């Protein structure tokens, strides 16, 4: 049961540090919890203090197939039931349309889900539209960058305060700037099982994925050229170590093959696309390559590279999983070995989905920590139980403050082994910042 | 005189951004008829700046800002040209404000001037304090000091402000170029020109991991050093761990109380040189100096001399000078010292900035992008045509703003072409899909580069 | 088997370049060569490139474990039958010597010979020494067999010139610097399989593989420490930006528990051993290490770390296949999770059992190319025409000359795409080097 | 006896010398061991090497250890002003100052040989570059009778010395300390990696990041130079004639190009590939050969490119052709501006001009102070250890029949190199493990004896 929890357990320093620091004066003495987000093995630890919550949970699982079959074997503590369901082999409407939203979510407060998408937002809260001014549970902390703001809340009558836990500082930095940097190091590693020293490769774009994918190749010992459409990112490319060139001739792509430089195209064998555009490598640069090229699409979505033209004119023969031998000028012959063929370094889509199945749980350590801690930036005052005159004074939608991320980062800093200095009272007022923080405004970029 | 132009002409070729403005808008001259009063320090680079400004049809008058910062021989060229300059140091320092007063006031009647290009000056102590009503003709003010914009915003909230102004210190092309890069280029040169030490195999202490901090860390590691990072912000200190550095503090359990028992003597006994990259006071007190390894080097790239302690040293430890970059300070006392003794310290400068005290700093190309945004501000202000708008709208537009992102990218475009690179141009079909026009900025305002 | 040949022939630029270059000259017109090396894939292409120049080549079996059954599919195309063995079939070795040397009941002559193991050379004089005074030379690839060859040369016995293909500047650089820097990354990926940027590791030994091992870890964001007994290697470590530490106080290993610096060993999260020595990591220093530390060995012998002490005095467990959990409680007695335990990676042994894929097939190319030039150089001289008096000078063993190494490296530079400048006559006499001969003396260390 | 512009300049040298000694442990450490013995009493060394502040401590330890030496500069722009005055203030007769002409260079090399108009008797020679060895080997073949030792420093000099032996004109045994590991892989590998980028920036102040450079030659100097340029953000290219060095250049992550198409140089304009040379802003020469940058390549380069040289001699780049065909103008000391429009017709606003560094001489000595102190530690120690070993033999007094075996070039054994390496590592703060008695029976060597065979190249 808990042996699965022991596998990570302390592997998530932030949440465990919160447990070992908030084991005294226990907050969140009110509502129960249900939970709906996907029940991975890692996820079912966000309860933190189960005694301060429902302790039955049952993991309502409002979104699609959130629960997992490991639930029956793992969640077996005292008084906490679980359904242990996966997939849709049976009817899902009986437990989704006729969900425990009314059964477990009884209209006498003492119930939370802390889920993604806010169940049904306006219609959800308007079934029992009396919780306003009586905040004793969930207050729309749903992450869900797709949900973003949902203006319907603002222009509508639903004025319950909400502070979504996405779009923080440590969430994005841990994913793109550092941490999950194994994006390119899943092909350029054993995936091509080749040495990259001395070769020349082309990477298009210089965004966060582009910035993270250009230091690894150079540290390997490769020669890299960067393309960009935005002057700021191109300048950043020039200033670090890289020359900025464009596939198209003279800086203008207008009509045909006469508007591409055929010199640099015929001497590069690896293409990495760190862009989310439509035609960043159309059927015009693949016509000029060094008789052998490997293409991996690291960018978002799958609309990049070619279009439904490369599939027919060039045969996508497969000789190895996630690897192909797309020909260029191998007319007839039935061999395509006279240096006229191209390797597909991926299947044509994101490597994290095709070439990879499992993902580390370290990326969500800073995601769950602030999401749990936001309830105490909430709760606490609970200005809902106040006259409505003061209610409209502070009604707005804000992202999570700076302190709620600095405290999360502090646990990760000392997890590896390290000490952060404490500001003396004299130094705090000289700058204009309290001793406990926060130290920087919202316009700082780090 | 003629020598100054010879110095100028060679350095002129290293600034694609300023020179490209003279021919990108060749013949259009959007800055026709604009009169500008400025007080930026007289340097070779600012000479290129003013020469670029004049080439667009406008005329400017410049003076000194700090008096002490001057090039002497560079003023001969401007004097021969005709624009009055008071870069020469005053014998009794009474010329600090007397010279600035002379440029502003002409004859005995007001004269038409619409723009001001100041550098952190005290014009508010002259213009906004002695004759605020004169602002009926000036349309905008350009400032670059990072602390100036906050003062301007506070004044706007107080309502005493009369004419809107725009700050440029919040631009990406300024913050990224002038802080992260440059210090990476200049830190190694500053260290080696005074010490000539083999940085490989040494151990260094860096206090702070901010804008200058990242460049300082990357500058010492590329030479083959061992670097440790001390930080008070967990978010900034987190970035040190993922950059390969280890986070330590000079105090036991991060608690400081003024007693000698709160200093970690094991860590401080292995460091070779120490730098300070913050803006606070006493980030390295006299207690850290006691535990430092003998024959250490002290550096400062912050703002003032109060970041690392020097008043204690001048009252308790000896001093000795050879060249005005490196000083000898003995860890025994002020009574005396021996020429052969080991108990001494090496201090880079007297605790002030080391980039100015060792070299020219960002020599010619990084400073190019800093000076290009200031000129592009004047064109935008003069295009607004404040005179044509009625007096009713004057109270509506009184606000403090920053350069729009569209004007910022053009400064960066010229820098790329200076390295011989080429920037791709979006097709009309591809631009509309991503949600940005072909020319308009491609990212929102809240993006973190 | 044809597919394996195509990839192997395309991954060996040196031999293929020699085959496509020296064709048309045929420097093996009058050579009678019989060869036997350890049976590998590259041995086939070595035979092919030897016979492409006109040499009369005969192949046999001289090693027992090197033979593989899967090679029979590839030899089926060839008209020459081969023999393979599974294990130590020493009793069958007499059959191989008799049948392969004696073709049709009559003695046979070979102008030059090239074998492996450095043991078959004595057989030539033992069985049929009559024609062994008419052999131009011998080239054998073996370790420590050159010692036996020089011993017999001082003792007389076999009268034939010799030259080895093991000592070369080209062979060292490809493998020691860029061939051994492959297992460490793979080993740590298999073991930890997570980001390790900011932690601390200790690497033992900085002779030749320590440099690659220590350079690979730093670019991943680790603090690397190096311990060494050779002062010159320590000096090279210091100049590269590392730190030199000693597990024992002042470096003196007194054998007691009071002479170990536990302060440093209490902050180390990984132990890497590279040196081929005994008791470089004793059980006393393995008891002062921090919890959850990981030990690994990439050296030569399996008895570098003080192993079997944890086997007897402590307990073991089973984890991910090449991961072992060793508990510091002692013999027996532990709770469900506890905190005192270490982790092994290969119990001090090699990773060839299946832990890592190992070095790629390109390793054998760097050494097999030199053998062709060794044969060609030791064939131009007229052994039958030289008098006995001058044969005293020719009766010597020398390493491969400097000229033959440069021809090997020239092909590698063109493979990646490059051009080598050619000297003018005026400059060549200023250095003292012919425009087509060795460029560096024998005392140049590169 | 001295000749300096001002005696006040010696104060800077000693303060740097004390700092130098504090950061030069091995030379000072071995000084104390032999101070009470004086094993080289009666030695006579005539020295000609770059008089840097690193170099002065060697003269100081030789003179305070019981020997008499005379020293002179090695190049026009070689001697630091403060280092020369410090040695001069100690009483040793030296000839060095600021500003020297080519005709004045030959006056100083022969001044050390002579003594007040009469020849000076000597026993050992410490020569850098082979200039002092050859100048007396032919003009005054008499001094070789008493002189019985020569110690060389650079790679080029040992080639000139070795050529003498084959011709039979060499008469004095020599010690080749340039082959020791603590000099070949320490002095001229890392010294350039620290000094080249300092010398480039101090003259031109260019922002190296994003620019392109070309480096000729990938020997020991080439590796350090390439790393120095690469760590600052440049995009560097390497040209080489030796295939092994080219292989090493490609493996590290550089690119190999040849200024002459297909590598064939024949003097015509069709040999030069103008396209590749049109995107280079910096060219550095490391080979040490003659005429590596010709007229067909120097005038066909991209506008406003920087030329500098680290080789020992000035024949790397053809400065003779451009001297009398193109006008030369000075922008600052040790840096020149050359307009290639015509012989004498140029204006200040011309767009076509090249910038020359150190006039083709050694750039790291002209526009920079040179190698640091801790890099030069591993060379002077071997020099001292070789001088003591050979002086005691007194080859000038050996029997004639024995001279047939004692007239050759020798090298120091590996134990001395190990001792120097240990004494230099101990000053960085490191601890070297000491082998237990059980270790010797497995490694194959004793506790204190050597650790590697002679075929080992590190
Ligand atoms: N690593 C991950 O897990 C992950 C997840 C989602 C998205 N991403 C990617 O991370 C990146 C970071 O975003 P960002 O805002 O820094 O960059 P971006 O989204 O704007 O990516 C494109 C980059 O290339 C440039 N570019 C745009 N269109 C181009 C075109 N047609 N041709 C060439 N260059 C073009 C842009 O200026 C930008 O620098 C995005 O590209 C996004 O797709 C990564
Ligand atoms: N000399 C130069 O070339 C140069 C260039 C730019 C800016 N500056 C000046 O120097 C300073 C550097 O600016 P910046 O961009 O680095 O600022 P920043 O705000 O980006 O960073 C300063 C850092 O100091 C840290 N800090 C403050 N007190 C601390 C303490 N006691 N211990 C540890 N860390 C502490 C903060 O957490 C912050 O991360 C500013 O005053 C700036 O005006 C100098
Ligand atoms: N891929 C591989 O695993 C591989 C490849 C080649 C060789 N090897 C084997 O590796 C072994 C080691 O040789 P190498 O190739 O690594 O190079 P190497 O022989 O140059 O390295 C040995 C180093 O260990 C140091 N050393 C010896 N005893 C020590 C001690 N007690 N404490 C600290 N340092 C000590 C020596 O000073 C030397 O620097 C050889 O026996 C060789 O067979 C392994
Ligand atoms: N601080 C200094 O300035 C300093 C220090 C040490 C050595 N040096 C000088 O450096 C020079 C060589 O140093 P090294 O020991 O590295 O020499 P090296 O012999 O080890 O290598 C020099 C390289 O030049 C190459 N080369 C020669 N002619 C060539 C040609 N025509 N085209 C291309 N490459 C060519 C050779 O292949 C060789 O690899 C010597 O002249 C020596 O005096 C100067
Ligand atoms: N600072 C220095 N002092 C003396 N000789 C040096 C110095 N730096 C380099 N050299 C030597 O100069 C010679 C060629 O310039 C080489 O032998 C090199 O080792």
Curated annotation (Swiss-Prot), chains A, C:
Question: Do you know which PROSITE patterns this protein is assigned to?
Answer: ADOHCYASE_1, ADOHCYASE_2
The protein's required cofactors: NAD(+)
According to its UniProt entry, what is the function of this protein?
A: May play a key role in the regulation of the intracellular concentration of adenosylhomocysteine.
UniProt subcellular location: Cytoplasm
**Keywords noted in UniProt:** Cytoplasm, Hydrolase, NAD, One-carbon metabolism
Question: What SMART domains does this protein map onto?
Answer: AdoHcyase (SM00996), AdoHcyase_NAD (SM00997)
Q: Name one GO molecular function term.
A: adenosylhomocysteinase activity
**Protein name from the UniProt record:** Adenosylhomocysteinase
Annotated family: Belongs to the adenosylhomocysteinase family.
What is the native source organism of this protein? Answer: Pseudomonas aeruginosa (strain ATCC 15692 / DSM 22644 / CIP 104116 / JCM 14847 / LMG 12228 / 1C / PRS 101 / PAO1)
The residues the record assigns to binding substrate are 40, 116, 141, 171, 175
Residues that bind NAD(+): 142-144, 176, 205-210, 228, 277, 298-300, 352
Gene3D superfamilies documented for this protein: Adenosylhomocysteinase-like (3.40.50.1480), NAD(P)-binding Rossmann-like Domain (3.40.50.720)
Give the catalysed reaction(s), semicolon-separated: S-adenosyl-L-homocysteine + H2O = L-homocysteine + adenosine
Please provide one cellular component term from the Gene Ontology annotations of this protein: cytosol
Keyword check for Hydrolase? yes
Q: In which pathway does it act?
A: Amino-acid biosynthesis; L-homocysteine biosynthesis; L-homocysteine from S-adenosyl-L-homocysteine: step 1/1
Tell me which Gene Ontology terms the entry assigns under biological process: L-homocysteine biosynthetic process; one-carbon metabolic process; S-adenosylmethionine cycle
Catalytic activity, EC: 3.13.2.1
The note on cofactor binding and number reads: Binds 1 NAD(+) per subunit.
Specify where it is mainly localized: cytoplasm
């Amino acid at each position: 049961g808990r042996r699965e929890l022991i596998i990570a357990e302390s592997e998530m320093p932030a949440l465990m540090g919160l447990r070992r620091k908030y084991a005294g004066q226990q907050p969140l003495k009110g509502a129960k919890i249900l939970g709906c987000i996907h029940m991975t093995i890692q996820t079912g630890v966000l309860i933190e203090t189960l005694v301060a919550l429902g302790a039955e949970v049952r993991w309502s699982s409002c979104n699609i197939f959130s629960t997992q079959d490991q639930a029956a074997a793992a969640i077996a503590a005292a008084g906490i039931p679980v359904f242990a369901w996966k997939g849709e082999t049976e009817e899902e409407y009986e437990w989704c349309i006729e969900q425990t939203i009314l059964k477990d979510g009884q209209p006498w407060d003492a119930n939370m889900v802390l889920d993604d998408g806010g169940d049904l937002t306006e219609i959800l809260h308007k079934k029992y539209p009396q919780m306003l001014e009586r905040i004793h549970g969930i207050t729309e902390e749903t992450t869900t960058g797709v949900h973003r703001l949902l203006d319907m809340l603002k222009n509508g009558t639903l004025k319950v305060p909400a502070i979504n836990v996405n779009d923080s500082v440590t969430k994005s930095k841990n994913d793109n700037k550092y941490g999950c940097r194994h994006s390119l190091n899943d092909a350029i590693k054993r995936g091509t099982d080749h040495l990259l020293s001395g070769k020349q490769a082309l990477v298009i774009g210089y965004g966060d994925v582009g910035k993270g994918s250009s230091q690894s190749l150079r540290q390997e010992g490769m020669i890299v050229k960067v393309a960009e459409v935005d002057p700021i990112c191109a300048m950043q490319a020039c200033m670090d170590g890289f020359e900025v060139v464009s596939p198209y001739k003279n800086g203008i792509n207008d009509g045909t093959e006469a508007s591409i430089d055929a010199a640099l195209l015929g001497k590069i064998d690896l293409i990495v696309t760190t862009t989310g555009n439509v035609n960043v490598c159309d059927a015009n640069m693949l016509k000029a390559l060094k008789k052998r090229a490997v293409v991996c699409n690291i960018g978002h979505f799958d609309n990049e590279i070619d279009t439904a033209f490369m599939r027919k004119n060039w045969a996508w023969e497969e000789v190895k999983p996630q690897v192909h031998k797309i020909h260029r000028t191998g007319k007839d012959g039935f061999d395509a070995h006279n240096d006229d063929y191209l390797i597909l370094l991926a299947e044509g889509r994101l490597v994290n989905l095709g070439n990879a199945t499992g993902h580390p749980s370290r990326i969500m350590d800073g995601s769950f920590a602030n999401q749990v801690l936001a309830q105490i930036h909430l709760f606490e005052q609970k200005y809902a139980d106040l006259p409505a005159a003061e209610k409209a004074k502070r009604l707005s939608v804000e992202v999570l403050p700076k302190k709620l991320d600095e405290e999360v980062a502090l646990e990760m800093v000392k997890g590896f082994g390290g000490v952060v200095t404490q500001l003396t009272p004299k130094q705090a007022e000289y700058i204009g910042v309290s001793v406990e923080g926060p130290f920087k405004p919202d316009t700082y970029r780090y």
